[model samples]
Target chain A: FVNQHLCGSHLVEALYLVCGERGSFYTPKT
Target chain B: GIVEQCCTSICSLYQLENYCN
Candidate 1:
């Protein structure tokens, strides 16, 4: 079991807003 | 930077995280 995970919600939100604004959907880079 | 929205208080993540690390 591990308690560590990898993620960046800010990036997600930015991507969401950014893509939404640019009309270019962008997904987080994993 | 407004990107610092959440960090000092653990709100979740900061905007820089998008390309930070």
Candidate 2:
């Protein structure tokens, strides 16, 4: 029953782009 | 500060859920 939010999707896409750009060592810290 | 904003928003969302319980 979690509330869906755009920011969640944005974070996922941002991480995807970051990974695509820098491989794996560029993960953003939570 | 884009990443920071996202992090802050996510943290706020978690806090809201905790508060809602």
Candidate 3:
């Protein structure tokens, strides 16, 4: 199964907090 | 679609290849 949305959102938020930008984010293919 | 978008986004932001796993 693909958890793309959930994972992507989590990563995006995480990166935004650390990287200070919400430009874009993504999850890898399985 | 979402996965590719996100992966592409992350890669673009970091200027790296395939950041998703």
Candidate 4:
């Protein structure tokens, strides 16, 4: 079996802080 | 130019799975 994941704590943290400040969100590219 | 990719560490992921169980 196999699985996929995104290990993005820094990304999440930056997103949380920056987006929270900017009132916008990040939509990661697929 | 330094182009790098973001990814999870093996040790971090191992710990994650261990604790998640």
**Recovered fraction of real interface contacts per model:** 0.00, 0.06, 0.00, 0.09
DockQ of 3: 0.09
DockQ per candidate, 2 decimals:
0.11, 0.08, 0.09, 0.11
Relative to the true structure, candidate 4 reaches a TM of 0.24
> What TM-score would candidate 3 get against the native?
0.26
lDDT of 1 by residue, A1-21 (tens): 222222455435554543332
lDDT of 2 at A15: 48
Query: Candidate 3 recovers what fraction of true contacts?
Result: 0.00
Badly placed stretches (over 4 Å) of model 4 are A1-7, A20-30, B1-21
- Candidates 2 and 4: which is better by TM-score? 2
Candidate 3: clashing pairs of residues: A26-B6, A26-B7
| Candidate 1 per-residue C-alpha lDDT over B1-21 given as tens digits, one digit per residue, 9 for 90 to 100 | 223344332333333334433
Residue-wise lDDT of candidate 2 within A1-30, one digit each (tens)? 433333534554544533332244433544
State the lDDT at B14 in candidate 3.
38
User: Per-residue CA lDDT of candidate 3, range A1-30, in tens?
Assistant: 232333435554544444534345442333
lDDT for each of the candidates?
0.37, 0.41, 0.40, 0.31
Which 10-residue window of candidate 3 chain A scores lowest in summed lDDT?
A: A1-10
For candidate 2 chain A, which ten residues in a row score worst on lDDT?
A17-26
B1-21: candidate 4 lDDT, tens digit per residue: 000122432333332232222
Candidate order by decreasing DockQ: 4, 1, 3, 2
Of 1 and 3, the candidate ranking higher by DockQ: 1
List the RMSD of every prediction in angstroms: 9.4, 11.6, 9.7, 10.5
